[PDB]
Design a protein around this nucleic acid. Structure first.
Lengths: 149, 147
DNA sequence: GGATAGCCTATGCTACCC
DNA sequence: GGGTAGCATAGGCTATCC
């Protein structure tokens, strides 16, 4: 029985469906309690949200969800994390060595909404079963902003 | 002519090309012997590098790894679009461009600043596309728990 | 809503060209 | 040291499973 190959939707062209819509609605409810400004007139991307861990699929679905809930943001594809510190006095891994742990980046126009978005993702995720509850989120601040093309 | 050389993702070593870029960086980083590590060892800061071209970004990445053993670096990935100009609707948050980026993780913000300065100065005397590479210092409120 | 199959195509990697 | 070729294997995407 089926199970897909090519569906004519390229990188970044993801549509919607109940699964991603339901995730988005979870975010929207939380976000609606904090009705803060998500845009500025200048429109620069001065803040971000760095999301990682859990599992590839759970991260992916979260990314798809955020996208539907927040048209005012911009989101990278999933990518991978390098390793952290090795314990003890020994040698460390090279800076390029990559792990199995994924991450994605959300860009935002206001610092205020970045904080709220971060809170919402945490709360959305903290009550769900593993691996989704293990998804970590941190606000990310850009000194000079980012010139998204 | 190359195909498979046995080197998987993240395993890249060194050669004259990358070491040359690394030495350029080392000289510049030597302008400011600030602390690059903490006792706690948390990844609280970074630099966000993007633009130029795929290859010039890539080569920079390789060079930084050789010049800065104390950092950790993502693979290259892609940027989503910004604001669309004028009358049209905005692109979806997921739509991706051709512009690449990578992230460097650091344990101190003070060195992030120096690393950024180093990259800008390293790149501004070069021709396009490399001179068009953009850098910003990056700060993680709650840090990043790199595996 | 997480995990997977399976086409498309992205990057990581190296050595070659110049 | 920028652009490339070309294997390996990342992810984006979907429907199907359950």
């Amino acid at each position: 029985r089926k199970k897909g190959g090519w569906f004519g939707k390229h990188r970044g062209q993801g549509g919607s469906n109940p699964k991603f819509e339901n995730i988005a609605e979870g975010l929207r409810v939380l976000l609606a309690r904090s009705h803060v400004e998500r845009t500025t007139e200048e429109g620069n991307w001065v803040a971000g949200v760095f999301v990682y861990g859990g599992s590839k699929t759970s991260l992916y679905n979260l990314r798809r969800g955020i996208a539907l809930a927040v048209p005012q943001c911009r989101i990278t594809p999933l990518s991978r994390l390098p390793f952290g510190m090795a314990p003890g006095p020994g040698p460390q891994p090279g800076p390029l060595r990559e792990s199995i742990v994924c991450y994605f980046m959300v860009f935002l126009q206001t610092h205020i909404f970045a904080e709220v978005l971060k809170d919402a993702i945490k709360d959305l995720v903290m009550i769900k079963p593993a691996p989704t509850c293990n998804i970590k989120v941190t606000v990310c601040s850009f000194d000079d902003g980012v010139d998204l093309p």
